[PDB]
């Protein structure tokens, strides 16, 4: 199909995410991706632009990395997929061993699934089944703080920010969960004391606290002091409420630590990972839990964990994930991310002086220009493309989560485009 043909079929038959159909955006045709770069069709002509978004925060080693391509083709040659019901295999074993070794201590059990939203559903199921296994089925609600996002399936939606979150129109049909106020950027003991007070009054009906550690992504690219996670861990411990960290966006080095929990030295009872898990090649996610959680879940009268995605532990997805994680661990990723952060900080600093900019902030390989108004994609997208960068703002944010392989020059091209988008926003 020609780009023309692709656009026609697309307009007629494809529903895009977070969109209407008809009077929708109008997507740009992508025809190739290599390293940090996408080949897009603009006015009938192919242009090369930097994938500043890492393809929604997944392509940490860039596209078509030789190690990941090879890992995929090697597995393809021997075994594409077998059912995980009754069978196991090397890629599943290798990936699970890697995951339990690099995640916060105590997470020794791995349940694979096909997507981040599903892994969150699995996390909640683990938490609820845990308490059923202890003969306390009243412990069935979740608690979180505002500003959060945990995916788009219906249980996941129930812990999305109920007022400004993308799922706010659904609140009347969602499970009603417990929400603490927005966690602040700077550490304030009074906030943690209030969180504890609120949790204490609901402790008998709470299965778990569920939060994104350090960085809240889709809810506003907000950062908070890691010490709050230390307080959550302690509160949950004392009141016997499970602690769940959703690291689907923060995992695999993105915030400057291997996992954002590591900024706090905290181990949750349950953890979700996804997105950058496969290096952005294929859909895969995982839910990890402690031995105590795993063993209790089938205690009393609860029985087996009745979850089993058809493509659970897919050998192809697991094999590229093994390669992606090994590639990350086999380099000095900590210095790499530090250099990326310094580059983002340096390149975004001029945005602070722009009239429509309210904040500039960087955490690891995350760079954010917060604006005083919602960012118009119709203006932003071509402005970024004109400067050789693929950017997709959302809410009032011009942000990047670039591939780890970006050179300092490429980072400066990305930040330059961001600043120019923000400049255009304010005029």
Ligand X SMILES: *Cc1c(COP(=O)(O)O)cnc(C)c1O
Ligand Y SMILES: C[C@H](N)C(=O)CCCCCC(=O)O
Show binding-site residues: 56, 116-117, 149, 246, 275, 308-310, 392
Asked if 56 is part of the footprint of ligand Y (rule: CB under 6 A), the reply reads: yes
Binding site for pyridoxal 5'-phosphate, by residue number, is 116-117, 246, 309-310
List the structure tokens of 416: 């330059």
Kindly write out the interface string for residues 363-402 of this chain, putting x where it contacts ligand Y by CB under 6 A and - elsewhere.
-----------------------------x-x--------
Torsion, Cα 304 309 315 319, to 10 degrees, reads -90
Site for ligand Y in 92-151 (CB under 6 A): none
Whose Cβ is closer to ligand Y: residue 88's or residue 310's? Answer: 310
The two beta strands, 178-180 and 141-145, are: parallel
Q: Residue 251 binds which entry of a copy of itself, ligand X, ligand Y, none, with Cβ cut-offs from 5 to 8 Å by kind?
A: none
Question: Shortest distance, CB of residue 275 to ligand X, whole angstroms?
Answer: 6
The two beta strands, 367-371 and 397-400, are: antiparallel
Burial zone of 142 (CB within 10 Å; 0-12 exposed, 13-18 middle, 19+ buried) = buried
Residue of 139, 191, 262, 275 marked active site: 275
| Catalytic-residue membership of 275 | yes
Residue of 161, 225, 231, 246 marked active site: 246
List the structure tokens of 288: 């990890």
Which residue is associated with the tokens 């120019």?
420
Question: Shortest distance, CB of residue 238 to ligand X, whole angstroms?
Answer: 26
Say which DSSP state 258 is in: S
Asked if 181 is part of the footprint of ligand Y (rule: CB under 6 A), the reply reads: no
- Breaks in the chain after residues, C-to-N cutoff 2.5 Å: 24
| Catalytic-residue membership of 399 | no
Kindly write out the interface string for residues 292-311 of this chain, putting x where it contacts ligand Y by CB under 6 A and - elsewhere.
----------------x-x-
The count of residues interacting with ligand Y (CB under 6 A) is 10
Asked if 214 is part of the footprint of ligand X (rule: CB under 6 A), the reply reads: no
Kindly write out the interface string for residues 337-376 of this chain, putting x where it contacts a copy of itself by CB under 8 A and - elsewhere.
----------------------------------------
30-38 LR contacts (CB < 8 Å, sep 24+): 31/3, 33/63, 33/64, 34/62, 34/63, 34/64, 35/62, 35/63, 35/64, 35/65, 35/403, 35/405, 36/62, 36/63, 36/402, 36/403, 36/405, 36/406, 36/410, 37/63, 38/63, 38/390
Asked if 15 is part of the footprint of ligand Y (rule: CB under 6 A), the reply reads: no
The number of residues making up the chain comes to: 427
Q: Which residues bind ligand X (CB under 6 A)?
A: 115-117, 120, 149-151, 212, 217-218, 246, 248-249, 274-275, 309-310
Q: Which residues bind ligand Y (CB under 6 A)?
A: 17-18, 56, 85, 152, 218, 308, 310, 392, 394
């Amino acid at each position: 199909l020609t780009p023309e043909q692709i656009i026609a079929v697309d307009g007629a038959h494809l529903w895009h995410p977070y969109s209407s159909i008809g009077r929708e955006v109008s997507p740009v045709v992508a025809v190739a991706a290599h390293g940090a770069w996408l080949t897009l069709i603009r006015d009938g002509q192919p242009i090369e632009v930097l994938d500043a978004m890492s393809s929604w925060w997944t392509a940490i080693h860039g596209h078509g990395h030789p190690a990941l391509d090879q890992a995929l083709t090697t597995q393809l040659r021997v075994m594409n997929h077998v059912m995980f019901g009754g069978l196991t295999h090397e890629p599943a074993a290798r990936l699970a061993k890697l995951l339990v070794d690099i995640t916060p201590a105590g997470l020794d059990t791995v349940f694979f699934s096909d997507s981040g939203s599903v892994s969150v559903e699995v996390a909640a199921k683990m938490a609820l089944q845990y308490w059923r296994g202890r003969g306390l089925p009243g412990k069935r609600r979740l608690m979180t703080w505002r500003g959060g996002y945990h995916g788009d399936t219906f249980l996941a939606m129930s812990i999305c920010d109920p007022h400004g979150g993308m799922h706010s129109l659904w609140t009347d049909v969602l499970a009603a969960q417990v929400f603490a106020p927005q966690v602040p950027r700077d550490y304030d003991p009074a906030y943690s004391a209030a969180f504890e007070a609120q949790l204490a009054q609901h402790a008998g009906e709470l299965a778990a606290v569920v939060v994104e550690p350090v960085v809240q992504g889709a809810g506003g690219m907000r950062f908070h002091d890691p010490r709050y996670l230390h307080d959550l861990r302690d509160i949950c411990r004392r009141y016997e409420v499970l602690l769940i960290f959703d690291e689907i966006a923060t995992g695999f080095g993105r915030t400057g630590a291997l996992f954002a929990a590591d900024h706090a030295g905290v181990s949750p009872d349950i953890m979700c990972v996804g997105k950058a898990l496969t290096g952005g090649y294929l859909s895969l996610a995982a839910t990890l839990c402690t031995a105590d959680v795993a063993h209790t879940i089938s205690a009393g009268a609860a029985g087996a964990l009745m979850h089993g995605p058809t493509f659970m532990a897919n050998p192809l997805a697991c094999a590229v994930s093994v390669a992606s994680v090994e590639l990350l661990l086999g380099q000095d990723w900590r210095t790499r991310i530090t250099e990326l952060a310094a580059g983002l900080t340096a390149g975004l600093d001029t945005a602070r002086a722009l009239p429509a900019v309210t904040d500039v902030r960087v955490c690891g390989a995350i760079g954010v220009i917060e604006c005083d108004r919602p960012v118009d994609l119709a203006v932003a997208t071509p402005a970024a493309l004109d400067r050789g960068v693929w950017l997709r703002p959302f809410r009032n944010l011009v942000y990047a989560m670039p591939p780890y392989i970006c050179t300092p020059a490429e980072i400066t091209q990305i930040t330059s485009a961001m600043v120019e988008v923000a400049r255009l926003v304010g005029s």
